Amino acid sequence: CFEPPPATTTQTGFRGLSMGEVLHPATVKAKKERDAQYPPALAAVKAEGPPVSQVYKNVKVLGNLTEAEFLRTMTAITEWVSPQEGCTYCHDENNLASEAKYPYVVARRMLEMTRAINTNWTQHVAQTGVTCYTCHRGTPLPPYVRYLEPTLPLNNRETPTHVERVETRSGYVVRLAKYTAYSALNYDPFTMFLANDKRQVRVVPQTALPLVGVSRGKERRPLSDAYATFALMMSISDSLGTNCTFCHNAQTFESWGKKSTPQRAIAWWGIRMVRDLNMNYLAPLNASLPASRLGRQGEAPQADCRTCHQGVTKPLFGASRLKDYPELGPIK
Amino acid sequence: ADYQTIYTQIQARGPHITVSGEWGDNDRVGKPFYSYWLGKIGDAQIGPIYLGASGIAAFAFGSTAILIILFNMAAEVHFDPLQFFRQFFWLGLYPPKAQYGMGIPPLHDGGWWLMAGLFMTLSLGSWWIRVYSRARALGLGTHIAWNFAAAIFFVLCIGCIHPTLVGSWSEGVPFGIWPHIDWLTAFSIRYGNFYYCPWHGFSIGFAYGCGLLFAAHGATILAVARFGGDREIEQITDRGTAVERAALFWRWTIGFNATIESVHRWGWFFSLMVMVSASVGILLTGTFVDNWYLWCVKHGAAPDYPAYLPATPDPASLPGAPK
Amino acid sequence: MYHGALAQHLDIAQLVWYAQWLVIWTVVLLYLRREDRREGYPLVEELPYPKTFVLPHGGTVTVPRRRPETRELKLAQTDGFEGAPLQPTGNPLVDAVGPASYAERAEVVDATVDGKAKIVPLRVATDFSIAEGDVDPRGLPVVAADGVEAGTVTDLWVDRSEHYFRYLELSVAGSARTALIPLGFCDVKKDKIVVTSILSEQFANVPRLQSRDQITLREEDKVSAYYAGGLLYATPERAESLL
Amino acid sequence: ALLSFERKYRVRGGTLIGGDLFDFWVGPYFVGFFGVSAIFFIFLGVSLIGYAASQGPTWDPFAISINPPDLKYGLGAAPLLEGGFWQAITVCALGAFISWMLREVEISRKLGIGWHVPLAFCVPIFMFCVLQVFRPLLLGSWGHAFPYGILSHLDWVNNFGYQYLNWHYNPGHMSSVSFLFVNAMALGLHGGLILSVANPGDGDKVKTAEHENQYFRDVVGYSIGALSIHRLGLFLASNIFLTGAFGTIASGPFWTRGWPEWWGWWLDIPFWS
Ligand code: BCB
Ligand code: BCB
Ligand code: BCB
Ligand SMILES: C/C=C1\c2cc3[nH]c4c(c3C)C(=O)[C@H](C(=O)OC)c4c3nc(cc4[nH]c(cc(n2)[C@@H]1C)c(C(C)=O)c4C)[C@@H](C)[C@@H]3CCC(=O)OC/C=C(\C)CCC[C@H](C)CCC[C@H](C)CCCC(C)C
Ligand SMILES: CC(C)=CCC/C(C)=C/CC/C(C)=C/CC/C(C)=C/CC/C(C)=C/CC/C(C)=C/CC/C(C)=C/CC1=C(C)C(=O)c2ccccc2C1=O
Ligand code: HEC
Ligand code: HEC
Ligand code: HEC
Ligand code: HEC
Ligand SMILES: [Fe+2]
16 A cells, blocks of 8 residues: 655756656665666677678678677577577577577567667667667566557566456456556557557647637547547656656646756657667567467567666666677667 | 534434425425434434425436446446446546547447436536525525536536537546546646646635635634524624624734625635636637647746756757657 | 737737636625625724615514614723723623623524524423433533532523524522523533533622523523633633733 | 724733733734734745845746755755745744734634634644645655745646646545535535525515525435534535645655556455456
8 A cells, every 4th residue: 555765756857846756765676686687798709700691601680790709699699588498499409590490580680670779779778778688688578568459467477367368358447557557548558659650649739829720620639639648658657667757847748948858858769769669670570470479460569668668767777788799789 | 612513412302393385395205314423413304305306307317327327337347247346446438539520429439428418417407406496495595506507517618618619529528537537637738737727726716715714614603603603694684792703803813804694705706716717717728728838928927947957959850850 | 820819919818817807806895895894884983785684583674783772881991002902890791891792682582483482491392302322411510610519400491493402501509590501611421510611609690581481682692601701701810821 | 993893802811922011902903922923924934035036037926936945955954045045934934824823812712712713724734834844854855845936836736746647546635625626515505505594585584594404405305504514614624634634745755656556456456356
């Protein structure tokens, strides 16, 4: 029912606006130990040697790396994605140049995706960047993924009840609710706003008065749009383990400048980056994945803000392996 | 320290009194009873109630609405009774999500809502005829009914008048516990922070005043209960030391005072105005004002604070940034 | 072009804002505050046209009241200051001044809807009774501020209009008379009645009633006021500061 | 200078401290010691607001705001300009409030009436201490208190709310808000009933206490009674804050998450999960 004091509070607005984070120190810690599990960077290796495009047979992405650097990349990959299963999870045990198992072809596209994130999205990921670990956390299937309908629990390493299961229609509202910070908001903000770029998040007018020609009748955006945008924000808030005042001055949610924080602009690239991963990298993987991984509409698992952030404003508290593994990005 | 104003020490029990109305004395139903515990902090007599055509009507249309709302709620949890008890607060019956202008929306997308809303209006319309008629019958003024009508008017404002004026049913309030509460934020955000609508401000100031006035008034009567202050009708027609000490309490405290009749006019007004202010603010929203915050920024009202964190440009304006 | 914008730099919402402020202050200053001046006006030592109340049981009454007699008030000036307090000349309880003051109410009995006497004892109210579970005070001793037994409860007086007990009738011991007291001044116990408002000796001087089985509005005030006057006038200590 | 019935009640005594020295009237107002300590705390309160307002960018009463310090100052004294003024104003406000409350006790004793109004005035004062003193004490800084502006204090309430995502789901709030609604509903009824009995219209006779009862018996099948409603009205008003205070003071010191999630305790019970 309740959480014992003290609380940990910061300030993001002008004194006396009640803007800032509210954190429970023990929870902040329960996350910190879980994000610390991050495997340390494998010791740097011999730079000299022939490229693996010549050395090996079936290298379509990492060809400009020397063999010594190439196997270090593979080991690192193995730590982050399938450390229980070892190399054999993607590879034919006898033939390492064969594409028999699907995690191989999927991993090459993942390799291409991870390099895209670090290279074409520094507006969001900055110098921290991402690795295979940011999402996977040591399992082939990342803990937090999204289908074209809400599913439970949010952590797919946990067993759902019959009610929590997607076949059971009677838990739909609850499935919906837990994705929107326990609200009754009757909108799936993932499939609406993050699954593609078809919808517009902003709903507030930027004029004091109603503009003629869009203010009456069928010319109007339905009020539902306001509900749905709110839904997305509850989801964004719960995903990063924060609140509205981290990015907005509630006085006016619509206004930038002094009324917004730098984090809001970073969040703005977040929406663009998530959309890009879903449309161009993640959703097309449905053809390459077996049905047991797919959703009820034949879709592949896609990512949201939680996938990387997992309850934290910085994924893994700004832990980076960018310099240590340069082959994963940026690419000049 | 008067214990009578905390609770009735010794209770009286007498025969039941029946004031005769000009009609419908036959329409009283039920044998009254007495609760010892209730009679400690109120009057012990419970019942009887009056029936009448306007009473039944409100119960008929009110039940029909309710049965519709409950049915669509039960529907929402695929008719699972355990999942009905559990998820009830989150369940609702919604206005259309899709825009159909003013045209009657599909039963699956707001039709059942509009029909449940019509029967609620009929129920509300009926009960008012009962609050009004029961006053005329007993030779009383219609003060209660006009305060009730103001409250009905506000409900009609947010229920059907505003959706009509802006031309979208989607704007109306969902039926449900959390759902109707969720509308409040949807509505505020869409029209740019209700804190900057002046009529919200007025409405709050009257609601806040209603707290003040009733706290103050109630405490005043209790303070003079020893002189029979609670017998207000005969204190108006024949001034007693009770309302003298009451009037002087305020005149020495705040410098001006009311009479025992007029403080019920101060409270009747302040109550009515909560709803009138509220009604006007809604009526102006969507029709004539689109963003109350920017409406305040225009007429130079909105306060300004310096930047704690650095001024953040809208990234959708930066060169070569996506849509 | 916008909806609601008018000439110059003026919009509809701006106009209704003013009309709102005017409506309020109209009613506040020109109505509600005039209704406040129907009692105790005009001042002594912007008026409304007098209001006539057509009474439930015959007759009419116009407010404010003007009594064909002004009652002499036994109070002396403390200082020459305009708003200086007044110090009692005689015995402030029997004179009835300050917290002991009574309003000049009509010397008529309060009436029930059908026309019977509203405030009556239980000896008349034969269809009235004390609820099972409650303490029947009839016969318990009445103990005052000094801890002295001042009398014995003899009857209760019930408000027949609301079915609510309003007075306790007690005999004042050794003084062969009865006195009424508001239940507000009575801490009802199982074994006794505690009355802290007045001392044991003062009970003899409680205002007497003209008739044994009924009480006028003015009498109801005289009695009620008496005990409340005691809250300041019982001992000489009850007037001075506490610290 | 006096009401036609005022002279008799203007007697000396009733004072808590001061005796004869403070016991007098200035116009209709009663003074006493607590009136002296009031006017002092008010005068010192308004004189400092204006000194901070002159140093501010504006003099437009809607925009003006005297804000508390940043969170780094904690429970220590802040620079007068950078939050110090706010701290000085609080002491004055509280000094004037309590003074005003006790002054009403002096007036009640003299009038020989109960101390119900000054007792009912405490509940507002308590809610003011909840927001300005007790909660900032539980969170570590005075920077958590609301600013003294006409429109700016709304902006504080706004942000405070959204810090917990949807404050409507706050169970202390729901309780508080319901009382606000029912007490404004109740007042309209009590005001409306009394007026209807005394002002029946046309040439109709004034009605009785039995008429009052029969009306609410007819309409809602129950009547509370003449005294009872004034007790209920104090209870209904007093519970806007008395319950609300619990939903305010839990937000932060006793609960950090969003308020909707708190209803997880209900939703997440294993046997219907
Ligand atoms: C958590 C809750 C907060 C809150 C949320 C709130 C909201 C949402 C809204 C208000 C509004 C208002 N609030 Mg605020 N409030 C106010 C006063 C005000 C008024 C400016 C205004 C009208 C309310 C009203 O009529 O009440 C009833 C009292 C009546 C009718 C008696 C008359 C009082 C008089 C109008 C008050 C004037 C105060 C002046 C600033 C003068 C100050 C003294 C000077 C001389 C130093 C005071 C004095 C305090 C204190 C001391 O704590 C306070 C605390 C809070 N308000 C809490 C911090 N308030 C309304 C507004 O529109 O503000 C712009 C409004 O919409
Ligand atoms: C993000 C959330 C915001 C918001 C959104 C909001 C909206 C959208 C609207 C308000 C409105 C109002 N807000 Mg507000 N608000 C208020 C208080 C208020 C009220 C004074 C006022 C009118 C509401 C009312 O009294 O209806 C209670 C009374 C009602 C609903 C009448 C009921 C009577 C009815 C005839 C009886 C029906 C009952 C039947 C028996 C039921 C039977 C039906 C069956 C069939 C199911 C306070 C005190 C605060 C503070 C302290 O912050 C605040 C902040 C906010 N509000 C936030 C800024 N508010 C209203 C307003 O004034 O707008 C201009 C309004 O429309
Ligand atoms: C985003 C905004 C949310 C929000 C944020 C919010 C917060 C953070 C808090 C509240 C609180 C409250 N909210 Mg609100 N809220 C409310 C209503 C309420 C109140 C019932 C309740 C308590 C107000 C209070 O403490 O006053 C305080 C007023 C005081 C103490 C008055 C001070 C009196 C002073 C001693 C006298 C003043 C003296 C003057 C200087 C004298 C003037 C002199 C002149 C005449 C010359 C409604 C009806 C709604 C609707 C309809 O939506 C709503 C929505 C919201 N609230 C939004 C969801 N609300 C409070 C609560 O209880 O939370 C559970 C609270 O802490
Ligand atoms: C159930 C509880 C309810 C309730 C109850 C009762 N209410 C009472 C009594 C009862 C019983 C009386 O005894 C007493 C009184 O006699 O009234 C006629 C009183 C009073 N309730 C007032 C205001 C009031 N009630 C509010 C709320 C409720 N009341 C709730 C709802 C609100 C809200 C909510 O906004 C307000 C503004 C004053 C008029 C009066 C004392 C002023 C004072 O003590 O004078 C002396 C003080 C001054 C004249 C000014 C002080 C200047 C200081 C030093 C500097 C100012 C700083 C300040 C903090 C600036 C902030 C403003 C900013 C946010 C914008
Ligand atoms: C000149 C000078 C410095 C003198 C020194 C003496 C001195 C200490 C003076 C005090 C100075 C100060 C600070 C004065 C300001 C006084 C104040 C606080 C005024 C605020 C008044 C306000 C706005 C109140 C809002 C409440 C409100 C709606 C009131 C209007 C309705 C009224 C009059 C309610 C009072 C009232 C109530 C509540 C009853 O129940 C009742 C029952 C039976 C009979 C009469 C009454 C009655 O008059
Ligand atoms: C899935 C996530 C993989 C795991 C775990 C490991 N490897 Fe891998 N392998 C994978 C890909 C996507 C590729 C091609 C990369 C590209 O840029 O196209 C490879 C390739 C190799 C090779 C080269 C074989 C050849 O083409 O001739 C070698 C030698 C290799 N991988 C080794 C290796 C080892 C030793 C691993 C365990 C520690 C390991 N890989 C893990 C996909 C995945
Ligand atoms: C930062 C990480 C944010 C937090 C925390 C919240 N929101 Fe937000 N919001 C954010 C961005 C980047 C955007 C713009 C999205 C775009 O693609 O343009 C928004 C937008 C809104 C809006 C709409 C404003 C408009 O221009 O119309 C609203 C009304 C809004 N946000 C509200 C809101 C609420 C209530 C939040 C708490 C749950 C919240 N936001 C959190 C970034 C961030
Ligand atoms: C993984 C690929 C990510 C996804 C999906 C999203 N974000 Fe993210 N974000 C990511 C990294 C590696 C970082 C750290 C960069 C840094 O500044 O150190 C961030 C950072 C943010 C921040 C700023 C945090 C702060 O300044 O303290 C915000 C506000 C943020 N991210 C929001 C956000 C949102 C709203 C997203 C969904 C639309 C989202 N991120 C997705 C990596 C990833
Ligand atoms: C977050 C976004 C990332 C990042 C940074 C990487 N991957 Fe992936 N991954 C992600 C999703 C949403 C999915 C679909 C769900 C699934 O199929 O598990 C995947 C999938 C894979 C798989 C297939 C696992 C399986 O189902 O058998 C593999 C083998 C894989 N990803 C590997 C991988 C590598 C090597 C990465 C770094 C270069 C990498 N991922 C990054 C989400 C994300
Ligand atoms: Fe009253």
